[PDB]
């Protein structure tokens, strides 16, 4: 039975992700609050120190000035025009604030732990949309280690070989209502689950409300049904069968060219199920391969057990001990008496005034002679010793700070660019590049919706869901974070500016700058004479 | 009653935010600082006495 | 334009906003705390007793 | 903070359709009269959201980027055309008015 | 209470510091026009 | 046991250090043509090489390499024959 | 060492006590320090007890031997870069 086997993958996934959920969830304990396990707010005190946020905000700060968008350069081959609209669609809906949120999930879960992710699914929005009238929906969510599990024995961090894609949404009641409404199910189904969250729950959140989403990966083996050019010349276009539903009739309008070739595709599929019973299996998905992109830190296989983690883990050790010391030291100064002389009780009982609280009487006389006794009193002169820290735990706080600064060393040069953090960026790199792969697959099913030919070279292609299967000529690559194609081309223009000889080449590149300008009458007229000389010079 | 701008009428701005149990945490560094601060301050009053 | 302090305790985004801008949140639950005169003027401009 | 600023822009643009959009544009003066209450074209989101420094006015924005490209420009003709564009943008007083006068004078004389 | 009350912190130096650096750079909006037909679109929009 | 457990090392600083220096310099292949008739021979050969070696699996092989080369002295990656029909290389194959 | 320790408080003897036990341990409001003095029989001539428990100080054997652990560790890890930040012994591994 389907739901049973999906509970098998759920079970193993949930095991290795219970060990890693203990780890990384304890990471979150450290960061958002502190290291304190076992006793919570007892008769002792509670101090906090760490180093955490300085180092975190440091590295996050360097990775957030260099967010690393995608290059995805065109083919090595026929034409380097292919980035074309593709970067238009990419940035159009990736310029939204949700992308940098995905970055926040990325670095947040990449410093403490080694993880991160963000969701991409299909939405259709009619407000100045992209072509085909769609936008991709992006949902990065925290606790991605305990949310999605890759345990299909993924050999690579991108998890291109993993069939799990087991990801849950934990929400409140209203979000459950809205979600069940948009996805068209009854609101009374009561979708509980094994929980993502902490294992204690000392505080008030009692609502479960967790809905599961599974995504299946098969090869689908697309076959034949390829057409030719609608206008008859340069035949043998690459077209599909299966994505085309019952209506081919617009292609039966005089296009309608038949050929048969067996092919091998790769196709995934979407399903939504909760813990109770099966809800929705096999629902429409767009991007083949992975719908939701993970991002990774340091990962390994010990026993072939997934370890996704980061440096903060080890730091935590020193951290806890460090913090304890202070609270301990607190009690040292919290529970103490003061320093006052210790005399004996028959030296007293006649005075008790000009001694304790009086600065007006520079007369210090205690009693002397008592009945019987010696009476020959010696010097009492007994004082209580002020606390001095043992110097064991003292330089061992120097040793806690020591160990901590040992396990955090990355640093920058006088140029303030490079350093070991770049390594994470490099891993970060793959993550970005990773999504691109799945992104391109979306393009065929969601919006491909234009074609091109030999020589205006732009095809009209009037119909729903038509394209050529030759769209992967572009190869995947990544680059800096660039705010627009105007600003990309401006950027590389500047890149080659200043390294160019002050003669003619500097002047043609310069004229290209005079072409690219933003707004205001001045830049419009400088653009005017710019283009003027450009065309006058052929 | 009549509203003008679609989507959100009132704009939030944010610092460091996260989901632990999927509990909203919006915060900044000063939080942690507070700890040392309180203890620090006490010392002086204590020294005062 | 009305920025106000204690925005954490004034407006709450708890519609399970996935993003800090809270573009997906339906709450937008925000309160105005004021004196008596501001209550009079506010009820006058917004037409209530 | 960036996102926050950019965030409001989104909602801001939405206001524009309902509160003041109130002008339209066309192919070639390209400016539409549009005499009525609450009329516009739904094609207004062609602009994409982005943020920048804090600038005190459009005169001072264009002046600012004028200065941005000033000094990195070859001391030959380009520095002089950008220079003349600076001579165009000026504030008040008879001196800046007349320097602006011969400024625009040479601008138009040079086509 | 019967004890005394001292105050120290560091707060306002760091606060006023960072506020000071963000207050020299208040970060207004660019909102550049379309990639497409016309880059005149900022137009009145920045005026309003 | 009833005792405590501390942890320190230096490990990850040195590891991430050297891995970082080797990961800025991943060292791809030249494979220059013959000394002889023609120096056109790199030709498609680098096309096929990089086409399916530009995938993210290569840097994973590098991660195995350096990871097992710092702690231990080892590393490896597998290459076998697969046939994929989505914009493949010539002969309609990709190496796994 | 710091986990299993008592605190530092004076050690007196039990017949100097039993009448007070309040303004001594936890009271900052009474700058009056008086223990008992004279007991039936005894001397009674009490000497200065002034017996305090010594705070832990690390043996300095294992201390500079942690300096020696860090020592040995940094001994067996030396590769480094120049002011150019390119070369160093790590290249050797790259060569392999």
UniProtKB/Swiss-Prot annotation, chain F:
Coiled coil: none annotated. It comes from the Viruses. It is found in: Virion. Homododecamer. Interacts with the terminase large subunit; this interaction allows the packaging of viral DNA. Interacts (via C-terminus) with the head-to-tail adapter protein gp4; this interaction participates in the head completion. Interacts with the scaffolding protein; this interaction initiates procapsid assembly, thereby ensuring incorporation of only one portal ring per capsid. Interacts with the capsid protein. Forms the portal vertex of the capsid. This portal plays critical roles in head assembly, genome packaging, neck/tail attachment, and genome ejection. Procapsid assembly may initiate with a nucleation complex composed of portal and scaffolding proteins. The portal protein multimerizes as a single ring-shaped homododecamer arranged around a central channel. Switches upon genome packaging from an asymmetrical conformation in the procapsid (PC-portal) to a symmetrical ring in the mature capsid (MV-portal). This change of conformation may serve as a signal for headful packaging. Belongs to the p22likevirus portal protein family. This is Portal protein. It comes from Salmonella phage P22. The gene is 1. The chain holds residues 50 to 145 of 725 of the full protein.
From Swiss-Prot, chain G:
Belongs to the p22likevirus portal protein family. Transmembrane segments: none annotated. It is found in: Virion. The chain holds residues 340 to 435 of 725 of the full protein. It comes from Salmonella phage P22. This is Portal protein. Homododecamer. Interacts with the terminase large subunit; this interaction allows the packaging of viral DNA. Interacts (via C-terminus) with the head-to-tail adapter protein gp4; this interaction participates in the head completion. Interacts with the scaffolding protein; this interaction initiates procapsid assembly, thereby ensuring incorporation of only one portal ring per capsid. Interacts with the capsid protein. Forms the portal vertex of the capsid. This portal plays critical roles in head assembly, genome packaging, neck/tail attachment, and genome ejection. Procapsid assembly may initiate with a nucleation complex composed of portal and scaffolding proteins. The portal protein multimerizes as a single ring-shaped homododecamer arranged around a central channel. Switches upon genome packaging from an asymmetrical conformation in the procapsid (PC-portal) to a symmetrical ring in the mature capsid (MV-portal). This change of conformation may serve as a signal for headful packaging.
């Amino acid at each position: 039975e389907s739901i049973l086997s999906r509970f098998d993958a759920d079970w193993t996934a949930s095991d290795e992700a219970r060990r890693e959920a203990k780890n990384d969830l304890f990471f979150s304990r450290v960061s958002q609050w502190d290291d304190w396990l076992s006793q919570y707010t007892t008769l002792q005190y509670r101090g906090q120190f760490d180093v955490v946020r300085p180092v975190v905000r440091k590295l996050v700060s360097e990775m957030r000035q260099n967010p690393i968008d995608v290059l995805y350069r065109p083919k090595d081959g026929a034409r380097p025009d292919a980035a074309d609209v593709l970067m238009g669609m990419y940035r159009t809906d990736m310029r939204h604030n949700t992308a940098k949120i995905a970055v926040n999930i990325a670095v947040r879960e990449q410093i403490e732990a080694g993880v991160g992710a963000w969701r991409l699914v299909t939405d259709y929005e009619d407000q100045s949309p992209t072509s085909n009238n769609q936008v991709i929906r992006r949902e990065p969510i925290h606790s991605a280690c305990s949310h999605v599990i890759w345990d299909s024995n993924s050999k690579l961090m991108d998890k291109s070989d993993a069939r799990h894609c087991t990801v849950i949404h934990s929400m409140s009641q209203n979000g459950w209502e809205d979600f069940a409404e948009k996805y068209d199910l009854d609101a009374d189904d009561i979708p509980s689950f094994q929980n993502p969250n902490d294992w204690v729950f000392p505080w008030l959140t009692q609502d479960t409300i967790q809905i599961a989403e599974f995504y299946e990966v098969v090869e689908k083996k697309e076959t034949a049904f390829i057409y030719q050019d609608p206008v008859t010349g340069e035949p043998v276009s690459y077209f599909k069968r299966d994505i085309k539903d019952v209506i081919d009739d617009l292609a039966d309008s005089g296009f309608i060219k038949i050929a048969e070739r067996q092919i091998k595709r790769r196709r995934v599929y979407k399903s939504i199920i909760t813990c109770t019973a099966v809800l929705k299996d096999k629902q429409l998905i767009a991007g083949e391969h992975i719908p939701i992109v993970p991002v990774f830190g340091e990962w390994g296989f010990v026993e072939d057990k997934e370890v996704y983690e980061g440096v903060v883990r080890l730091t935590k050790d020193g951290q806890r001990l460090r913090n304890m010391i202070m609270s301990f030291n607190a009690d040292i100064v919290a529970r103490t008496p003061k320093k006052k002389p210790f005399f004996w009780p028959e030296q007293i009982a006649g005075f008790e005034h000009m001694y304790d609280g009086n600065d007006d009487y520079p007369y210090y006389l205690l009693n002397r002679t008592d009945e019987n006794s010696g009476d020959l009193p010696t010097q009492p002169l007994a004082y209580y010793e002020n606390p001095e820290v043992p110097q064991a735990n003292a330089y061992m706080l120097e040793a806690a700070t020591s160990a901590v600064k040992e396990v955090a060393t990355l640093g920058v040069d006088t140029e303030a660019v490079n350093g070991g953090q770049v390594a994470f960026d490099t891993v970060n790199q793959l993550n970005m590049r990773a999504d691109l792969e799945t992104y391109v697959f979306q393009d065929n099913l969601a919006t491909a919706m234009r074609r091109d030919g030999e020589i205006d070279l732009a095809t009209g292609e009037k119909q729903v869901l038509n394209d050529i299967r030759g769209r992967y000529e572009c190869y995947t690559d990544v680059g800096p974070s660039f705010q627009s194609m105007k600003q990309q081309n401006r950027a590389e223009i500047l890149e080659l500016l200043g390294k160019t000889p002050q003669g003619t080449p500097e002047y043609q590149l310069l004229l290209l700058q005079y072409f690219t300008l933003l707004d205001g009458k001045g830049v419009e007229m400088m653009r005017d004479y710019a283009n003027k000389q450009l065309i006058q010079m052929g």
